[PDB]
Amino acid sequence: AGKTKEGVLYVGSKTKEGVVHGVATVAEKTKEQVTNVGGAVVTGVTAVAQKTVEGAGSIAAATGFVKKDQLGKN
Amino acid sequence: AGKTKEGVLYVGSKTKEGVVHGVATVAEKTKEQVTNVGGAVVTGVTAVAQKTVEGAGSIAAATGFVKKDQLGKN
Amino acid sequence: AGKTKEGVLYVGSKTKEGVVHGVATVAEKTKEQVTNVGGAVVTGVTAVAQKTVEGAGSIAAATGFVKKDQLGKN
Amino acid sequence: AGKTKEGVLYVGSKTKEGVVHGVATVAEKTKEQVTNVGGAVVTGVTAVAQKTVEGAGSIAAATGFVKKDQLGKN
Amino acid sequence: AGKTKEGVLYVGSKTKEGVVHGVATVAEKTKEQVTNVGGAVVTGVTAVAQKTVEGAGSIAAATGFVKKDQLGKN
Amino acid sequence: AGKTKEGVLYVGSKTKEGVVHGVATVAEKTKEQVTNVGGAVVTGVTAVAQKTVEGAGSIAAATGFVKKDQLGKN
Amino acid sequence: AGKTKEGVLYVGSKTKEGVVHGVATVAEKTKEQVTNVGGAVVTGVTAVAQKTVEGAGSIAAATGFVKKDQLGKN
Amino acid sequence: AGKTKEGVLYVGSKTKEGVVHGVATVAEKTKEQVTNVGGAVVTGVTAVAQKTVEGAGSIAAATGFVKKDQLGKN
Amino acid sequence: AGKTKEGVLYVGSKTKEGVVHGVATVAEKTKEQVTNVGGAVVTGVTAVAQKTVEGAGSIAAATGFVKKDQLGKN
Amino acid sequence: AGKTKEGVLYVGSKTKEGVVHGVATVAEKTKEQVTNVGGAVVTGVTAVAQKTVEGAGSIAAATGFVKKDQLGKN
């Protein structure tokens, strides 16, 4: 009854809607309702995962992130 | 009754809609309702996973991310 | 009753619609409803997975990502 | 009662529609409803998977991704 | 009661429509409803899978992806 | 009045005996004289030479050298 | 009046004997004279030479050297 | 009147014997004379040479040297 | 009247014997004379040479040297 | 009238014998004379040389040296 993780890199999100506008819900009229319920949003993220190494060992890594989305004249 | 992970790299998301506008739900009228329920959204993400190595070992990696989506005049 | 993963790289998402506008749901009228329910969306993502290696070992990798989608004058 | 994966690289998504506009659902009238339910969408993604190697070993890989979809004047 | 994979590379998606506009569903009138239910969409994705190798071993690979779909004046 | 080399791999040796036991040399008597004068002796040597390459490019090579000459009981 | 080298890998040695036991040399008697005059002796040596490369590029190489000459009972 | 080298890897030695037991040299009698005059002796030496590279680039190399010459019972 | 070197790796030695037991040299009798005059002796030496690189770049290398010559019972 | 070096790694030694037991040298009798005159002797030496790099850059290297020559019972 347990979990073991080593050098594991993962991204995610757990969420349960359950009822949500249910179970004896008249509702009738609803306007533009925008809610953020769970979800995994990651951008420009770097990570490094390594196991066990014996003897001489060296790790080298380089990353770069400049700008992403650009909106023109509207 | 457990899970073991080593040098594993994965991206995902778990979500349950369940009822959602159900179970005795009249609804009647609903406007543009936009909600984010679960989902995996990753962009410009780098990662490194390695196992066990014996003796001399070296790791080298390089990544670059500049701009992505561009919107013209609307 | 368990799972074992080593140097595994996968991307996905688990989601259950369940009822969703069901189970005693009149509905009647519904406007443009856009909701994000589960899904795997990954762009510009790099990863490296290796097993166990004995003796001298070296890993080299390079990736580049510049721009992607471009929208012209509308 | 378990699963074992080593150096496995796969992309996918699991989703269940279930009822969805069913089970005592009048519906009547429905507008342009667009929802994202499960699905695997990956673009510009690179990955490397290797097994166990004995003795001297070297891995070299290079990938490049510039632009993709372009929209002209509308 | 388990599955074993080694150096396996596959892309796919599992989804169940189930009822979907069924099971006591009047429907009556439905507008242009576009929903993404399951599916495998991968473009510009590269991967490498190798088994176990004894003695000296080297792996070299190179891929390139520039532009894809282009829309002219409409 | 010059030389140009690019990605050239060669092994050799330049030596001039000139006089050597000459030019007014009585000599008379000479014992087992063993001298090493110039010569190219290379064993277990590896090298890689490449020219100019445009676009994505990858190089992979592996060599091994274990034992060579063995002398039995004398 | 010059030399240009790029990514060139060569092994050699320059030596001039000139006179050596010459030019008014009686000598008379000479015992086992062993002298090392110039010469190229390289064993278990590895090297890598590459030119100019444009765009993504990766280099991978692996070499091993264990034992060489073995003398038995004399 | 000059020399230019770039990413060049070479091993050698320059030596001039000149007279050496010459030019009015009686000598008469000479015992086992052993002298080391110039020469290139390199064993278990590794080196890496690369030119100019544009864009993402990665270099990976691994070498090993254990034992070489072995003398048995004499 | 000059020399230019960039990322150049070489091993050697310059020596001039000149006269050496010459030029009005009776000598008469000489015992086992052993002198070290110039010469290049390098063992278990590693080096790395790289040129100019633009953009992301990574270098990885690993070397090992254990024991070499072994003398048995004499 | 000058020399320019950048990221250059070399090992050597300059020595001139000149006269040495010459120029009006009777000598007559000489015992086992052992003198060290110039020469390059390097063992277990590592070095790293790199040029100019623009943007993100990482360098990783690892070396090991244990024991070398072993003398048995004499």
UniProtKB/Swiss-Prot annotation, chains A, B, C, D, E, F, G, H, I, J:
Impact when changing residue 21 to A: Impairs copper-binding
One Gene Ontology term, aspect cellular component: nuclear outer membrane
UniProt-reported outcome of changing residue 1 to P: In PARK1; no effect on oligomerization
Top-rank taxon, per record: Eukaryota
PTM sites of type Phosphoserine: 58
Disease connection: Genetic alterations of SNCA resulting in aberrant polymerization into fibrils, are associated with several neurodegenerative diseases (synucleinopathies). SNCA fibrillar aggregates represent the major non A-beta component of Alzheimer disease amyloid plaque, and a major component of Lewy body inclusions. They are also found within Lewy body (LB)-like intraneuronal inclusions, glial inclusions and axonal spheroids in neurodegeneration with brain iron accumulation type 1.
Name used for this protein in its record: Alpha-synuclein
Organism: Homo sapiens (Human)
Gene: SNCA
Parent-record interval covered: 30 to 103 of 140
